[PDB]
Design a protein around this motif. Sequence first.
Motif, PDB file in Angstrom:
ATOM      1  N   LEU A 108      55.771  25.135  17.754  1.00 13.93           N
ATOM      2  CA  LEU A 108      56.920  24.312  17.435  1.00 13.93           C
ATOM      3  C   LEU A 108      57.536  24.676  16.093  1.00 13.93           C
ATOM      4  O   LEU A 108      58.749  24.585  16.009  1.00 13.93           O
ATOM      5  CB  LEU A 108      56.580  22.804  17.520  1.00 13.93           C
ATOM      6  CG  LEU A 108      56.200  22.345  18.906  1.00 13.93           C
ATOM      7  CD1 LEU A 108      55.685  20.931  18.796  1.00 13.93           C
ATOM      8  CD2 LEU A 108      57.296  22.520  19.942  1.00 13.93           C
ATOM      9  N   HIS A 109      56.753  25.198  15.118  1.00 14.46           N
ATOM     10  CA  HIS A 109      57.299  25.717  13.848  1.00 14.46           C
ATOM     11  C   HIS A 109      58.268  26.893  14.094  1.00 14.46           C
ATOM     12  O   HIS A 109      59.354  26.923  13.524  1.00 14.46           O
ATOM     13  CB  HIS A 109      56.152  26.109  12.859  1.00 14.46           C
ATOM     14  CG  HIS A 109      56.550  26.147  11.414  1.00 14.46           C
ATOM     15  ND1 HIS A 109      56.419  27.268  10.616  1.00 14.46           N
ATOM     16  CD2 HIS A 109      57.063  25.181  10.608  1.00 14.46           C
ATOM     17  CE1 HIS A 109      56.835  26.989   9.390  1.00 14.46           C
ATOM     18  NE2 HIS A 109      57.267  25.744   9.372  1.00 14.46           N
ATOM     19  N   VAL A 110      57.914  27.835  14.964  1.00 10.35           N
ATOM     20  CA  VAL A 110      58.802  28.942  15.224  1.00 10.35           C
ATOM     21  C   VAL A 110      59.952  28.504  16.118  1.00 10.35           C
ATOM     22  O   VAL A 110      61.090  28.927  15.942  1.00 10.35           O
ATOM     23  CB  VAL A 110      58.097  30.237  15.767  1.00 10.35           C
ATOM     24  CG1 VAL A 110      57.616  30.085  17.207  1.00 10.35           C
ATOM     25  CG2 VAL A 110      59.054  31.430  15.671  1.00 10.35           C
TER      26      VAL A 110
ATOM     27  N   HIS B 299      58.795  39.355  21.886  1.00  8.97           N
ATOM     28  CA  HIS B 299      59.391  40.473  21.170  1.00  8.97           C
ATOM     29  C   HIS B 299      60.476  39.959  20.179  1.00  8.97           C
ATOM     30  O   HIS B 299      60.505  40.380  19.023  1.00  8.97           O
ATOM     31  CB  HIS B 299      60.071  41.474  22.153  1.00  8.97           C
ATOM     32  CG  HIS B 299      60.814  42.568  21.467  1.00  8.97           C
ATOM     33  ND1 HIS B 299      60.210  43.752  21.133  1.00  8.97           N
ATOM     34  CD2 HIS B 299      62.095  42.653  21.031  1.00  8.97           C
ATOM     35  CE1 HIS B 299      61.085  44.518  20.500  1.00  8.97           C
ATOM     36  NE2 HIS B 299      62.235  43.869  20.422  1.00  8.97           N
ATOM     37  N   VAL B 300      61.346  39.036  20.647  1.00  7.25           N
ATOM     38  CA  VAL B 300      62.485  38.595  19.831  1.00  7.25           C
ATOM     39  C   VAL B 300      61.989  37.763  18.642  1.00  7.25           C
ATOM     40  O   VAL B 300      62.444  37.945  17.505  1.00  7.25           O
ATOM     41  CB  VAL B 300      63.595  37.928  20.691  1.00  7.25           C
ATOM     42  CG1 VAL B 300      64.603  37.207  19.813  1.00  7.25           C
ATOM     43  CG2 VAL B 300      64.281  38.979  21.596  1.00  7.25           C
ATOM     44  N   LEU B 301      61.033  36.849  18.913  1.00 10.41           N
ATOM     45  CA  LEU B 301      60.497  36.016  17.895  1.00 10.41           C
ATOM     46  C   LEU B 301      59.773  36.901  16.865  1.00 10.41           C
ATOM     47  O   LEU B 301      59.867  36.619  15.646  1.00 10.41           O
ATOM     48  CB  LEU B 301      59.535  34.940  18.437  1.00 10.41           C
ATOM     49  CG  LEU B 301      60.164  33.886  19.334  1.00 10.41           C
ATOM     50  CD1 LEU B 301      59.155  32.863  19.778  1.00 10.41           C
ATOM     51  CD2 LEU B 301      61.389  33.251  18.810  1.00 10.41           C
ATOM     52  N   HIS B 302      59.075  37.931  17.330  1.00 10.09           N
ATOM     53  CA  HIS B 302      58.344  38.802  16.391  1.00 10.09           C
ATOM     54  C   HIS B 302      59.337  39.504  15.446  1.00 10.09           C
ATOM     55  O   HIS B 302      59.100  39.618  14.245  1.00 10.09           O
ATOM     56  CB  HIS B 302      57.537  39.819  17.206  1.00 10.09           C
ATOM     57  CG  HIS B 302      56.943  40.937  16.390  1.00 10.09           C
ATOM     58  ND1 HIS B 302      55.753  40.818  15.693  1.00 10.09           N
ATOM     59  CD2 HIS B 302      57.441  42.155  16.082  1.00 10.09           C
ATOM     60  CE1 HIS B 302      55.510  41.955  15.045  1.00 10.09           C
ATOM     61  NE2 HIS B 302      56.519  42.784  15.269  1.00 10.09           N
ATOM     62  N   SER B 303      60.469  39.936  16.006  1.00  3.90           N
ATOM     63  CA  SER B 303      61.470  40.719  15.300  1.00  3.90           C
ATOM     64  C   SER B 303      62.252  39.801  14.327  1.00  3.90           C
ATOM     65  O   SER B 303      62.489  40.177  13.126  1.00  3.90           O
ATOM     66  CB  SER B 303      62.416  41.357  16.311  1.00  3.90           C
ATOM     67  OG  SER B 303      63.466  41.994  15.651  1.00  3.90           O
ATOM     68  N   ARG B 304      62.641  38.600  14.807  1.00  5.84           N
ATOM     69  CA  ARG B 304      63.502  37.723  14.032  1.00  5.84           C
ATOM     70  C   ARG B 304      62.791  36.852  13.007  1.00  5.84           C
ATOM     71  O   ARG B 304      63.445  36.451  12.026  1.00  5.84           O
ATOM     72  CB  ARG B 304      64.377  36.820  14.935  1.00  5.84           C
ATOM     73  CG  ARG B 304      65.414  37.606  15.679  1.00  5.84           C
ATOM     74  CD  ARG B 304      66.368  36.804  16.613  1.00  5.84           C
ATOM     75  NE  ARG B 304      67.229  35.947  15.813  1.00  5.84           N
ATOM     76  CZ  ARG B 304      68.474  35.547  16.105  1.00  5.84           C
ATOM     77  NH1 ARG B 304      69.167  35.992  17.143  1.00  5.84           N
ATOM     78  NH2 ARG B 304      69.058  34.743  15.267  1.00  5.84           N
ATOM     79  N   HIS B 305      61.542  36.482  13.276  1.00  8.69           N
ATOM     80  CA  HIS B 305      60.805  35.388  12.593  1.00  8.69           C
ATOM     81  C   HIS B 305      59.440  35.867  12.109  1.00  8.69           C
ATOM     82  O   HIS B 305      58.446  35.137  12.266  1.00  8.69           O
ATOM     83  CB  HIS B 305      60.726  34.138  13.492  1.00  8.69           C
ATOM     84  CG  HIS B 305      62.080  33.620  13.821  1.00  8.69           C
ATOM     85  ND1 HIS B 305      62.896  33.132  12.804  1.00  8.69           N
ATOM     86  CD2 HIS B 305      62.797  33.561  14.965  1.00  8.69           C
ATOM     87  CE1 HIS B 305      64.077  32.829  13.328  1.00  8.69           C
ATOM     88  NE2 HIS B 305      64.038  33.059  14.642  1.00  8.69           N
ATOM     89  N   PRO B 306      59.397  36.977  11.342  1.00 10.49           N
ATOM     90  CA  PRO B 306      58.038  37.345  10.878  1.00 10.49           C
ATOM     91  C   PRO B 306      57.347  36.314   9.962  1.00 10.49           C
ATOM     92  O   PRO B 306      56.113  36.218   9.982  1.00 10.49           O
ATOM     93  CB  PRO B 306      58.290  38.688  10.140  1.00 10.49           C
ATOM     94  CG  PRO B 306      59.722  38.583   9.703  1.00 10.49           C
ATOM     95  CD  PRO B 306      60.360  37.994  10.915  1.00 10.49           C
ATOM     96  N   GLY B 307      58.116  35.467   9.310  1.00 10.17           N
ATOM     97  CA  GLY B 307      57.624  34.405   8.457  1.00 10.17           C
ATOM     98  C   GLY B 307      56.964  33.228   9.199  1.00 10.17           C
ATOM     99  O   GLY B 307      56.235  32.376   8.576  1.00 10.17           O
TER     100      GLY B 307
END
Length: 153
Positions: A11-13, A113-121
Amino acid sequence: VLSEGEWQLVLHVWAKVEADVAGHGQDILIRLFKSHPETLEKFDRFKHLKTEAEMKASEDLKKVGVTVLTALGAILKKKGHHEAELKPLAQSHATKHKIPIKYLEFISEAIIHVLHSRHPGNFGADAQGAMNKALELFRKDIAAKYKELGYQG
Ligand code: HEM
Ligand SMILES: O=N[O-]
Ligand SMILES: O=N[O-]
Ligand SMILES: O=N[O-]
Ligand SMILES: O=N[O-]
């Protein structure tokens, strides 16, 4: 079954997705169609789209992407108590659209893939593992529903 800590990472991401659901939806669908072009053939309304640029310019594609990610968000926010949300979704995807489980795996991989690329934090290894667990639960429950509904999946 996910722990509360796993759900919080999911839920954080997701909260970041919700800053721009339309953009995330375009990125995810495009990733899916690029990585697994056969999946585009399921979408009668835009299966003619030939390029990423055409995909990005499609207002209809953007709308569909918002719709997917919003319905998935609603499921994730249930934290596994999603039976009511899954019923109509399983029915339409089984019976109307005929979406195999393999294709749900492909969109799961595109989301990751998209979350990894956009949201490394917000999408380090532990967070990605939590998302994968949540998506696996989703697919497992949808698969059980497909079987109840008569669809091989
Ligand atoms: C996380 C996974 C998915 C969710 C949450 C989701 C959700 C939705 C929702 C809410 C709709 C609109 C209402 C409905 O028809 O049920 C929709 C439409 C549709 N979905 Fe999905 N979907 C998912 C995955 C897929 C995949 C992987 C495919 C194809 C490979 C697919 C194909 C379709 C099609 C063809 C439509 C009709 C689209 C249109 O309006 O032109 N869906 N989906
Ligand atoms: O802010 N939710 O799309
Ligand atoms: O529009 N379903 O991915
Ligand atoms: O079951 N809905 O197409
Ligand atoms: O779209 N999967 O890497």
